[PDB]
Design brief:
Keywords: ADP ribosyltransferase, transferase
Helix content: 10-25%
Structural class: alpha+beta
PDB class: transferase
GO molecular function, one term: metal ion binding
InterPro entries: NarE-like
Number of domains: 1
Distance between the termini: 33 Å
Assembly: monomeric
Strand order of the largest sheet: 1-3-6
């Protein structure tokens, strides 16, 4: 529900080796609130994970390095993303947004000019790089999505 998220990986090696897509190490476990000016801060320590630290880090330096999940307002993003990223030969997983809504995970949507007709909604996880392991409601492998729409061309 909400939105259909799609993400694919060619590093099935790292995924299967870690047995969780990617190495993780969550902590903090603080209040956190998406206020108009969300100075929710955290514990007290000065480091990574959450806070203006992670927010500014991803905004300034690691611009969508994989910490947060960037997705478009179009469900057909799946096909476009899989093709343009050359995932046609690799691994792909699907995630539902309503799960994040239940999780109370944050989202920051950037807007291009009005008529491009699209907004980029980046899903701000409470930690960098897929903090929820069960967010992947579907996992499939892909070897060329041939046929189906091949009516003639």
């Amino acid at each position: 529900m909400g939105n259909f998220l799609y993400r694919g990986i060619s590093c099935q090696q790292d995924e299967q080796n870690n047995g969780q897509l990617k190495p993780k190490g969550n902590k903090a476990e603080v209040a956190i609130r998406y206020d108009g000016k969300f100075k929710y801060d955290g514990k007290a320590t000065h480091g990574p994970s959450v806070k203006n630290a992670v927010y500014a880090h991803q905004i300034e330096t690691g611009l969508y390095d994989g910490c947060y999940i960037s997705t478009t307002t179009d469900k057909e993003i799946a096909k476009k993303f899989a093709t343009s990223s050359g995932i046609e030969n690799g691994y792909i997983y699907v995630l539902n947004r309503d799960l994040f809504g239940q999780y109370s995970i944050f989202e920051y949507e950037v807007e291009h000019p009005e008529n491009p007709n699209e907004k980029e909604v980046t899903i701000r996880a409470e930690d960098c790089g897929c903090i929820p392991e069960e967010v992947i409601i579907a996992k499939e492998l892909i070897e060329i999505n041939l046929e189906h729409h091949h009516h003639h061309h």
